[PDB]
């Protein structure tokens, strides 16, 4: 096995800018035939990977004039001239020299833009869910950028760390934002004992944490 390594998991770039993705092999993909057996593919994202460049410096068919492969020995570099919306995805560098064939981790291309604030929202357990013996408090933090954010669940001022399940959507194609859905679950035995449930969110677009809350006896 030849370990294929890709430094950064993700690399953000604004549309129009030039991107440079690095790949690193374990040995050396040289041949003597004069060719270096390196391959670049593009998963995108619920779509199938597509060959971009073969034999290190060869633009496959259909692949635009803006992509470009370069490097030597163990240092390989993919380069996009003008980043367009379609280029978004995980880029894979794979070797086709020794057996078995190995694939690099994968460097994802994210889009940059102006910072936006998370439109946080908190929802109390449904009347129907409660009657089933369970209680779930849902907190939605809609459109925001960058991707980084932190949700601290509070129950009567005490931080709840066990029982929370997060779910972040992929980067939106249209506005280039990020969404998340924090859900806390209890026993409808531990839920009745409390008054307030807070969904706190620490983001770059706020000097202080965005706090959304609700109290049980409150109509």
């Amino acid at each position: 096995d030849i370990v294929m390594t890709q430094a950064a998991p993700s690399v953000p770039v604004t549309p129009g800018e030039s991107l440079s993705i690095s790949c690193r092999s374990s040995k050396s993909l040289l041949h003597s035939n004069g060719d270096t057996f390196l391959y670049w593919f593009l998963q995108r994202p619920g779509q199938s990977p597509q060959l971009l460049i073969y034999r290190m410096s060869n633009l496959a068919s259909g692949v635009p004039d803006r992509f470009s492969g370069s490097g030597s020995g163990t240092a390989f570099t993919l380069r996009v001239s003008r980043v367009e919306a379609e280029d978004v995805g995980v880029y894979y560098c794979m070797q086709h020299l020794e057996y078995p064939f190995t694939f690099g981790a994968g460097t994802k291309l994210e889009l940059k833009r102006a910072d936006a604030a998370p439109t946080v929202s908190i929802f109390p357990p449904s009347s129907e869910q409660l009657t089933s013996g369970g209680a779930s408090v849902v907190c939605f933090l809609n459109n925001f950028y960058p991707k980084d954010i932190n949700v601290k669940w509070k129950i009567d001022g005490s931080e709840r760390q066990n029982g929370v399940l997060n779910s972040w959507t992929d980067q939106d194609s249209k506005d280039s934002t990020y969404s998340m859905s924090s859900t806390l679950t209890l026993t409808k035995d531990e839920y009745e004992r409390h008054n307030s449930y807070t969904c706190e969110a620490t983001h770059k677009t706020s000097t202080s944490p965005i706090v959304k809350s609700f109290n049980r006896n409150e109509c």
Binding site: Y54, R55, T102, N142, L165, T169
Partner: protein
């Protein structure tokens, strides 16, 4: 019009086996190799093995040999891969890529992959719970509502808001596995004018259990 179409969603339990397909079109099936790649939910991508369709000579990954059995079908233009002694470590997406062996050595086209799911043998219909706020001022225009789909198996779920009318503002979140079940939730940003005097009912569908549940948000 050169394309490769794979079988699709696979229904397997531990210890059993499953046969993945990958029909090739738009070209001579015999003068091009056929690799098979595996991909964990988000762990990466890896080679399993190729097969020369001109003569069934196969080459496998030592780590997948003894579990993977590639077999072609020159009856027309189809390709198969058997996965025996399935473990939960096999739950993943498998791709089938063509290959220009001789000159380029370039894996040209690809299939759409086949999601093989091997679980502790569960199967359960979801429970849909409507999500409405606890208060809301009229000045606070864009009102956000939601639909919590909890306790189901297996994927996927068809979540819609009115009947397909409510398109914009729909955020259907990626389902995260609980213990032995899946759970997701969706939300919509609707103006403070329509909601109060207009119904919002999310349409949840579970093909696996063949159940349709409509729940009004109030």
């Amino acid at each position: 019009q050169i394309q490769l179409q794979q079988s699709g969603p696979e229904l397997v339990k531990p210890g059993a086996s499953v046969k993945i397909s990958c029909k090739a079109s738009g070209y001579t099936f015999t003068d091009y190799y056929i690799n098979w790649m595996k991909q964990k939910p988000g762990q990466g991508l890896e080679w399993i093995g190729w097969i020369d369709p001109g003569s069934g000579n196969t080459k496998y990954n030592e780590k997948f040999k003894g579990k993977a059995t590639l077999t072609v079908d020159t009856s027309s233009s189809t390709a198969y891969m058997q996965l025996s002694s399935l473990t939960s470590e096999d739950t993943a997406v498998y791709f089938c890529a063509r290959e220009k062996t001789t000159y380029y050595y370039a894996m040209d086209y690809w299939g759409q992959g086949t999601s093989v799911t091997v679980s502790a043998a569960k199967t359960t219909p979801p429970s849909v719970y409507p999500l409405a706020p606890g208060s809301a001022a009229q000045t606070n225009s864009m009102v956000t509502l939601g639909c919590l789909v909890k306790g189901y198996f297996p994927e996927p779920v068809t979540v819609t808001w009115n009947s397909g009318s409510l398109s914009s503002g729909v955020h259907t979140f990626p389902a995260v596995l609980q213990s032995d079940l899946y759970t997701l939730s969706s939300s919509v940003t609707v103006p403070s004018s329509p909601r109060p005097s207009e119904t919002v009912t999310c349409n949840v569908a579970h093909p696996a259990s063949s159940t349709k549940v409509d729940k009004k948000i109030v």
